[PDB]
Amino acid sequence: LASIFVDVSSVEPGVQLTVKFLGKPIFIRRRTEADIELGRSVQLGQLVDTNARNANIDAGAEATDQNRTLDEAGEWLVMWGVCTHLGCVPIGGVSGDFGGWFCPCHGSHFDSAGRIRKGPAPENLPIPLAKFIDETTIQLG
Ligand code: FES
d(CA 131, CA 141): 9
d(CA 78, CA 24): 13
d(CA 64, CA 8): 24
Start-to-end Cα distance in the chain: 9
24 CB under 6 A from ligand 1? no
Burial 92-110 (b: 16+ CB within 10 A, else e): bebbbebbbbbbebeebbb
Judge contact between 68 and 115, C-beta under 8 A. yes
| CA angle in degrees (0–180, nearest 5) for 11-15-21 | 75
Nearest alpha-carbon partner for 118 in 49, 44, 27: 49
Domain 1-141: assigned CATH number: 2.102.10.10
109 labelled catalytic: no
Pocket perturbation via mutation, ligand 1, pick of 82, 86, 110 by most ligand atoms within 8 A of CB: 86
106, 131, 132, 137: the active-site residue: 106
Judge contact between 95 and 133, C-beta under 8 A. no
Nearest alpha-carbon partner for 68 in 97, 100, 90: 100
Judge contact between 41 and 98, C-beta under 8 A. no
Judge contact between 38 and 111, C-beta under 8 A. yes
Q: Classify residue 10 by burial, with Cβ atoms within 10 Å: 0-12, 13-18, 19+.
A: exposed
Method: X-ray
